[PDB]
Amino acid sequence: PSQVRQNYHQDAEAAINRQINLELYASYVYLSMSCYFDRDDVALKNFAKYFLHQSHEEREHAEKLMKLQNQRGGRIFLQDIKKPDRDDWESGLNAMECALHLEKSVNQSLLELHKLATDKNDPHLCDFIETYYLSEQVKSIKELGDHVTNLRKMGAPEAGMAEYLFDKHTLG
């Protein structure tokens, strides 16, 4: 038992390691999206910048969880970061929809984590998740949903100027 460990159940430790892997996976998905918008046959620089920023933020989310694990006396166990589900994201709209789907999955994992921490009466972990993760995810889900709504309304992907003007105004 670690000298610092107190009120930190092994199941919470395991769940945090699973959450760290999920955050790194999301970063890598966002990186793939960012790479796709940089292709010469896609050529949407603002979409590329948006998703690269999202990748870096998710890397920060993972590192903050690692700090939490070490702070509570648990031991980080890293696992393979699986490749994203596709290399061709097909459009700005499609990419935003997939990012929405991803963000809601991460949100769902965090809610399961919070329920475990509440079941284990770990108040510190609950408040950590509440303060640094759940509100951020709610904001990001709302942002992505707004992006999808606007793109769909503009006629994306079929209306040729829709992704181009969205890239300039909203993401520029």
Question: Does 103 engage in binding with Zn ion (CB under 5 A)?
Answer: no
Could you please report the per-residue DSSP string of the chain?
Answer: --TT--S--HHHHHHHHHHHHHHHHHHHHHHHHHHHHTSTTT--HHHHHHHHHHHHHHHHHHHHHHHHHHHTT--------PPPS-S---SHHHHHHHHHHHHHHHHHHHHHHHHHHHHTT-HHHHHHHIIIIIHHHHHHHHHHHHHHHHHHHHTTTTSHHHHHHHHHHT--
Region 33-62 residues binding Zn ion, contact defined as CB under 5 A:
58, 61
Binding mask 132-161 for a copy of itself (x = CB under 8 A): --xx--xx-xx--xxxxxx--xxx---xxx
Task: State which residue, 93 or 110, has the beta carbon closest to Zn ion.
Answer: 110
Closest to a copy of itself by CB, 10 or 160: 160
- Restricted to residues 53-112, the positions that interact with a copy of itself (CB under 8 A) are 59, 63, 66-67, 69-73, 75-84, 87, 100, 104, 107-108, 111
How big is the site for a copy of itself, counted in residues (CB under 8 A)?
80
What's the closest the beta carbon of residue 37 comes to a copy of itself, in angstroms? 10
Nearer to a copy of itself, 11 or 135 (CB): 135
Q: Which of 6, 14, 53, 90 binds a copy of itself (CB under 8 A)?
A: 6
Q: How far apart are CA 63 and CA 25, in angstroms?
A: 13
Residues at the binding site are 23, 58, 61, 103, 137
